[PDB]
Amino acid sequence: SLLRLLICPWLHMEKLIGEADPASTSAEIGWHVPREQLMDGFIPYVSIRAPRLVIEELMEKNWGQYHAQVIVTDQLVVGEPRRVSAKAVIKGNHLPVKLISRFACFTLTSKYEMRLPCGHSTGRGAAYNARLAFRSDLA
Amino acid sequence: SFRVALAGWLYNGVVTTVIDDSSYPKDGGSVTSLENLWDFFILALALPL
Amino acid sequence: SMILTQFGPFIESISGITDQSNDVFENAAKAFSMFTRSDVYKALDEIPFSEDAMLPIPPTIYTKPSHDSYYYIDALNRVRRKTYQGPDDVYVPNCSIVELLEPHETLTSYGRLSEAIENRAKDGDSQARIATTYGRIAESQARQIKAPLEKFVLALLVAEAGGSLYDPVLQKYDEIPGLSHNCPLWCFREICRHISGPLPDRAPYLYLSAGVFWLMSPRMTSAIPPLLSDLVNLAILQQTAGLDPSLVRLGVQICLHAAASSSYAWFILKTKSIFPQNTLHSMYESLEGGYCPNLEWLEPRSDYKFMYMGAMPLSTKYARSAPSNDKKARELGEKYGLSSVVSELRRRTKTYSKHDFTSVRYIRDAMACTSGIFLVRTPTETVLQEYTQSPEIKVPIPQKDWTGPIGEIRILKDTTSSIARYLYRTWYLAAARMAAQPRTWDPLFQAIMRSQYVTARGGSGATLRESLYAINVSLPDFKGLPVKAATKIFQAAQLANLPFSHTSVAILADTSMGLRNQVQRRPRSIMPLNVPQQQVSAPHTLTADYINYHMNLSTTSGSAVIEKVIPLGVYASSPPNQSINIDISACDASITWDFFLSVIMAAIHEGVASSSIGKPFMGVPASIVNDESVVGVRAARPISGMQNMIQHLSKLYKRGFSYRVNDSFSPGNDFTHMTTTFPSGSTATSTEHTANNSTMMETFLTVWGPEHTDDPDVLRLMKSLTIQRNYVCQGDDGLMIIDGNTAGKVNSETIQKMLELISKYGEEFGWKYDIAYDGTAEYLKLYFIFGCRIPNLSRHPIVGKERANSSAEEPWPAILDQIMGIFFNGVHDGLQWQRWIRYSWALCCAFSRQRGYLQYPMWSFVYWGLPLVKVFGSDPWIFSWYMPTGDLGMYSWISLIRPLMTRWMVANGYVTDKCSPVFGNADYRKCFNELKLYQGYYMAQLPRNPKKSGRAAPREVREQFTQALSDYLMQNPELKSRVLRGRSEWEKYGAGIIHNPPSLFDVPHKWYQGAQEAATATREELAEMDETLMRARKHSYSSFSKLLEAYLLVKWRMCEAREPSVDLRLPLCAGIDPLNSDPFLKMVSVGPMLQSTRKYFAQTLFMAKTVSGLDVNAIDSALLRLRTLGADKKALTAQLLMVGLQESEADALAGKIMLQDVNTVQLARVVNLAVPDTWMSLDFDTMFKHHVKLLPKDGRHLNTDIPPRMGWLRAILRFLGAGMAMTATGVAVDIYLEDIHGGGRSLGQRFMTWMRQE
RNA sequence: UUUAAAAAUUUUAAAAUAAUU
RNA sequence: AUAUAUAUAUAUUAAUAUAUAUAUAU
RNA sequence: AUAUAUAUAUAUAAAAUUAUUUUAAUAUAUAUAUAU
Ligand SMILES: O=c1ccn([C@@H]2O[C@H](COP(=O)(O)OP(=O)(O)OP(=O)(O)O)[C@@H](O)[C@H]2O)c(=O)[nH]1
Ligand SMILES: [Mg+2]
Ligand SMILES: [Mg+2]
Predict the structure, then answer these.
(1) What compartments host this protein (chain B) (predicted)?
(2) Contacts of C1143 (CB under 8 A, 6+ apart)
């Protein structure tokens, strides 16, 4: 009953977006912190994959009325992309599935972490009161 | 209880098996009472063994 | 000196020396108002305390560490307390408070939290959050009173300035030591001194509406507010209750040790059982004599009928035989340093060897010395300590005793070897018999059960809304409505036109949180379930109700406590008999899916199946589900609505509940928490708890006991007990009576062994019985020893008022209700009558004036119930408090003085040439206006709450709201057809006799208003009330009410003292002894209550049930107006139809109305004469029946004659006799009718015109 | 030949006070 | 001059937290 | 990216047993009687 949900929706979407453009059919929706407070980097928290016409529709949804306290650290991870671990605690309400409609294939798990590909220096960590924000390319 | 009553048939001379005191109706009972009727039924079926 | 020079006249007035008057009253109230706190503590300085009040105070109370080390932060960003000893230390700590405050702008010695800390915490800092949480929680702990302590202390000084009192019964001045032996006052003054020091301001903090301002002194801590509240309570109790000064010292010592420890509430919580454990639970290790009541319980025990049969003398054989309470008590006393106090109590208790008034007074005094504070802690600590408890199930139901699934449910195999089979059988039979009744299948019962839970109180409508939103379903919002937002009325209006398959997703939604503190117990917790979750839990509560009322039938719920529950303890504690006290610790957390809810849901799902095969329940469809209960077969089987609901409710109970915590005392805590604890907000809660309690006890005694014990004694004890003749339970707690056989008290070792068997029984399936067998009764917080009720004075704190939030208090005149409640609580506890009355006089002035002023005359307080002292030049202390409240009480106290009352009037000027039948020639109409009697009498009758006016919402949205609400009420075609046919028949026949005949269409128009007034009042309404009170005070009045006028035509005659109704040597209530003369005489000459005499003319024409939205008044007035005028029966039937009744049922009610001629309902509706509160403990029924005689003493008179067709008048006559007899001090006497001015027929015609005019 | 018994019903729906689970 | 009741007539419906927009400064 | 003032809106606190007290004009006008 669970593995069917885990596997089946992706195989169907692979027929629809098997050959389209990855830039046009993609998205990612995480916790945003402004360019200041470096004393922009967002923790992913989800990775959508869907056709272009639905990415256009998801681009305009609110996505901003969801808050959480993100606590960035300075620890490094052995993985290839230079990224620093983090944390997050949602406040108030949890993201209902209705926003990510029945037409997109999202992921059910995710680690909290931020990548630092600019001026490599990890300073002191902090908490920032992040806000959810949709993040796709031009598309 | 069943198996030990069955096994006590052949040690009649050293041990005698009886029905427990607490199986009989309360205060002698009375046949105006359903529970005492069923207690009597259980005793009547169990005694011959 | 100061208080004397201020208000010597008031001291003389309330102390029974000088006649009372309004001028001294209002002048004293002026003195109370124009008066400062520095004046208070200077007056305290004037008191030359003796050495008796002296005591060594620990110096550690003042120097305390900082709050930072007591807190930390969770991995979930939650600021929570760091326990240092045990998982209980989660209360407010004892720390400094000065380094977190900023100076107030006006009062430079007081201040609140610095705004810098609050803003830095709101930004998200760690230390700022911790400091602001500590500050807010300390403020909340200091805000748990009902008024500033200095005001209560001033009232105490006022009352005690008069000195001792003279007893009109004992003929002597009582020996109660003055203030110079009151060590609580001494400790209060010394603490305030040592904290203030050189500073001129004397109050260590000033209680205000918004928040408390701390006195900025380095000698300050957070333990001082509760300590001061304790000391004030102890001082007031010692002065108005006659506690001896040898135990108040021990109480003050324990309070000091509490204030000198790590945290105060935690110490008081660990040390809450040193006085009861060493006095009440250890009395009478050696008897020598004394009397105890001889009650006999009548034979159909289940109905709770008693009979007092005299006092039997005690003997040596009835000495205490329960197990000893020595080692554990000394262990507790040693673990906390309170060993000297424990040894003193344990020694002083062993000197009482006679059941006497003095020993019960000893117990009362020893138990009034425990602190009565409302314990307080952060909400995130309550939710994280209470809701983490889980059942400890040591013998689970085997997995091979469950059939396959039927939807969300599995069934117990009939061949199970567990003990759950008897539970399953009980709930199955209950469900079957409930569903078999034809009453549960009409639309009226469906609608009543629907509307049972649609109230104006919150139901967490938010999470309902945002959970329905998650499946793309809309909901009306009704923008612009003055109605409250978080109310179940609002949810119900939203959820009118919605199919069940849509709203069923909101059954798994989470719940909000509620909080509430108590005396001597951890802060309560609450959860309100929404409308869908309350709907789907109908079969559970219905089956629980059927079990409680028909099958098991061992409970006191739904019965009057003071007529059935008090003498239960009186019987179960009398010496030949014994009592075991059984309680279930953590009852909510012990009811989960793995033992109770699974079995209960399978039972209720199977029992209902027979008589509900295709029908819908309260708006629920007839869904289908496939079953696998039979091996090898798998088939989809239809089910019912009442089974569909059990399916949804089971899928809710399986996962547990998720609580959304968001406390306003710690910034940054709005987490969500998920538990398995059964909720305490469901409709089905309090009934299913008692059902499970009774069921498990009966299965205990019938099955588990005899199968695990071998000695003949315990077997014979468990066979002679049944839950219906030897057990009484209500919800969590319980009581087990053990009758005494002919050989005397039942043996003790056998009872103990049975107790440990019960303790072992609880652990198999989760419960943890807290059993107490020591020779005293315990039920619903009522204590009994040898048949003598013992009031617990620590549970009724005089100054304590609870505030689980930060909201401000209701403005004056909202506090007079609480003051009257304080007086009544003192009344029900048997305090020294003269002292308590005088203190209440002194206290009802200080809360009488406040800002263009508006003052209450004392006559209003006399109207509310407070009894006079010395009015009109009479003798001091003639009136008791048993005088009722209102017109009856006024008539009562007037008629006893009327002759002197008029000769005084004539002796000071007031004279006229008009022979009034009541007051003769004196002109009462001018003097009572002058003396401000009419003013108080008519100002007391005015409400003191802002009547919430409609804010004139828009017509469109209001119409839509009321329409959707009505659609929710009348959902099925049958109710609508009934009401529409009723309206048609009314317009055919009843058109003209009534203009707005009530139906089921005016219910929404009452729910809408009930949503209105749940909001906050506005300044317009406050100013309106102030101006209305001023107006009603500034008139000129000409007479009393018409009812009191008609009353005053009747005279009486006090002839003979009735014979005693109880022995004068038998203690029946501790504190009511010969020292307490008036209550003792009333109790011994009237006798206690052991009868049932409810409803003295509560007759009405409407004898059926309808929705809670409707009112009995409208339907009753309509039926009365339609029966007096004599219309056709079709009109009555049309009214009863459109009020939502069946045809045959409505017509049976019409026949009922046609019987029982309407001369009684009219009087019952015109007059409001009831039995006052204070008479509930006495035997007023026989006083009405036999000892108020309407045939006067020397025969007929031609005036007291009553016409044959006016029988209702005898009722009012018996009223007036009983009230006039109970008002006077001394013993109750035979009162005879004396004379009716006018005549019997004339007075009857006077009442009859009023009855007719309806 | 005149008098008189009169109905003791409910579970009374909501709002305030107090007690309890 | 004021108020009460009697018949009728008339009008009439009754604390903490968060989000959004304006403005000023950086 | 932020701070302050303003205006608007929103969310949060339950069920049961017991006893007591209150819940048929909203207002005015004419004719009637009465009291101050
Ligand atoms: O704050 C609650 C207190 C309890 N009552 C109701 O009383 C029932 C039992 O109440 P509790 O479950 O709170 O008593 P308890 O276990 O704390 O007893 P101890 O361990 O202290 O000995 C629950 O079903 C609840 O609904 C609530 O209405 N208010
Ligand atoms: Mg408890
Ligand atoms: Mg409890």
Answers:
(1) Virion
(2) C978, C1133, C1137
Both tokens assigned to A35:
């360019």
Cβ(C376)–Cβ(C517) below 8 Å: yes
Compute how many other C-beta atoms are within 10 angstroms of the C-beta atom of residue C444: 21
Q: How far apart are CA C579 and CA C366, in angstroms?
A: 22
**Which residue's alpha carbon is at the smallest distance from atom 15 of ligand 1?**
C586
Q: How was this structure determined?
A: cryo-EM
Q: List the residue whose alpha carbon is closest to atom 8 of ligand 1.
A: C732
Closest ligand relative to C769 C-alpha: 1
Cα–Cα dist C864/C867, whole Å: 9
Q: Give the DSSP H or E segment for C788.
A: strand C788-790
> Residue C405 in 3-state DSSP?
strand
Question: Does the CB of C950 fall within 7 Å of any strand E atom?
Answer: yes
Strands A126-127 and C788-790, how do they pair?
A: unpaired
Protein CA C1202 to sugar C1' D4 (Å):
12
Distance of CA C834 to the CA centre of its chain: 26
Separation CA A54–CA A57 (nearest Å):
5
Write the single-letter amino acid at C174: D
Residues C93 and C263: beta-carbon distance below 8 Å: yes
Is B32 in the C-facing interface, judged by CB distances under 8 Å?
no
C960 is written with which tokens? 């839509």
Tell me if A127 and C670 make a contact (CB, 8 A cut-off): no
Q: What is Dmax (Cα atoms) for chain A?
A: 47
> Does residue C474 contact residue C509 with C-beta atoms inside 8 Å?
no
- Contact status, residue C360 vs residue C790, Cβ threshold 8 Å: yes
Q: What is the dihedral of CA C694, C695, C696, C699, to 10 degrees?
A: 120
> Closest Cα of chain C to A97: distance in Å?
7
Alpha-carbon distances of C912 from C334, C909, C919, C924, rounded to whole Å: 77, 10, 11, 9
Rounded distance from Cα C521 to ligand 1 centre (Å)? 11
Distance CA C266, CA C275 (A): 17
Of A89, A92, A129, the CB nearest to C76: A89
Distance from residue C1253's CA to nucleotide E7's C1', rounded to whole Å: 15
Instruction: Give the pair of three-digit tokens for residue A66.
Output: 């969801």
Residue nearest to nucleotide E16 (CA to C1'): C664
Alpha-carbon span C395 to C1006, nearest angstrom: 52
* CA–CA gap between residue B36 and residue B25 (Å, rounded): 6
Smallest CA-to-CA distance from C1077 within C867, C880, C874 is with C880
Within 7 A of a protein CB, which nucleotides of strand D?
A: 3-21
Q: For chain B, state the CA radius of gyration.
A: 13
Contact B39, B24 (CB under 8 A): yes
Peptide bond into C476 cis (omega under 30): no
Q: HEC states along C805-842?
A: CCCCCCCCCCHHHHHHHHHHHHHHCCCCHHHHHHHHHH
First to last CA, chain B: 11
- DSSP reduced 3-state for C310: strand
- Of all nucleotides, the one whose C1′ comes closest to residue C1002's CA is D13
Report phi then psi at C636, rounded to 5. Answer: -75, 125
Q: How many Å from the CA of C997 to C1' of D14?
A: 19
Whether the CB of C1072 is less than 7 Å away from nucleic strand F comes out as: no
Question: Count of residues for chain A?
Answer: 139
**Nearest Cα to C1117, choosing from C1236, C988, C1209, C993?**
C993
Residues of chain B contacting C712 with CB distance shorter than 8 Å: 21
C1247 near C1163, Cβ under 8 Å?
yes
The Cα–Cα gap between C938 and C245 comes to 44
For chain C, what is the total number of helices (H) and then of strands (E)? Answer: 48, 30
DSSP code for C979: H
What gap in Å lies between CA C790 and CA C829, rounded to an integer?
A: 9
